[PDB]
């Protein structure tokens, strides 16, 4: 006879964005109406000494 | 729609003469401007050993 000694499968490992140290550079925010948004902007006012 | 989520202003830092290290070389006094005819004559007799 031929014998089969067990069958194995790949135990995949999971990666998350907020767990990576690269996330330190990001400030992550969820926004449900994002698909409706066209463009976003910020404005700065500077007076020099 | 279009979004604005920032307005910012520049926070100035103040500088003073008396709080600077350069002021140590000075002897700064505030006095009236009583029209002293170009008072460029300070005459000194300094004792010499």
Swiss-Prot record, chains A, B:
Domain of life according to the entry: Viruses
Cellular compartment(s): Virion; Host nucleus
Subunit structure: Homomultimer. Makes the hexons and eleven out of twelve pentons. Interacts with triplex proteins 1/TRX1 and 2/TRX2; adjacent capsomers are linked together in groups of three by triplexes, heterotrimeric complexes composed of one molecule of TRX1 and two molecules of TRX2. Interacts with scaffold protein; this interaction allows efficient MCP transport to the host nucleus. Interacts with capsid vertex component 2/CVC2. Interacts with the small capsomere-interacting protein/SCP.
Stated role: Self-assembles to form an icosahedral capsid with a T=16 symmetry, about 200 nm in diameter, and consisting of 150 hexons and 12 pentons (total of 162 capsomers). Hexons form the edges and faces of the capsid and are each composed of six MCP molecules. In contrast, one penton is found at each of the 12 vertices. Eleven of the pentons are MCP pentamers, while the last vertex is occupied by the portal complex.
Similarity field: Belongs to the herpesviridae major capsid protein family.
Protein name: Major capsid protein
Annotated source species: Human cytomegalovirus (strain AD169)
Gene from which this protein is expressed: MCP
Full-protein residues shown: 50 to 98 of 1370
């Amino acid at each position: 006879f031929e014998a089969i000694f067990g069958t194995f499968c790949n135990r995949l490992e999971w990666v998350y964005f907020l767990t990576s140290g690269l996330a330190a550079a990001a400030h992550a925010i969820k926004f449900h109406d994002l698909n409706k948004l066209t463009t976003g902007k910020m404005l700065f006012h500077v007076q020099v000494p």
